[PDB]
Amino acid sequence: TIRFSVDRPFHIVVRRRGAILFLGSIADPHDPGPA
């Protein structure tokens, strides 16, 4: 029911078992192409 549009600078936290594996602040998305 809630819209979450990540259409401006955002932050991302990749984590596992209490540790932050990757921490990023993304401002200009570069497309790697479809998976």
Q: How far is CA 2 from CA 5, 6, in A?
A: 10, 13
Which of positions 1-35 make contact with another protein (CB under 8 A)? 1-35
Q: How far is CA 33 from CA 24, 29, 30, in A?
A: 20, 11, 9
- Minimum CB–partner distance for residue 16 and another protein (Å): 5
- Minimum CB–partner distance for residue 26 and another protein (Å): 6
- Minimum CB–partner distance for residue 33 and another protein (Å): 8
Q: Which two tokens stand for residue 14?
A: 């990749």
Kindly list the residues in this chain that would bind another protein in the complex (CB under 8 A). 1-35
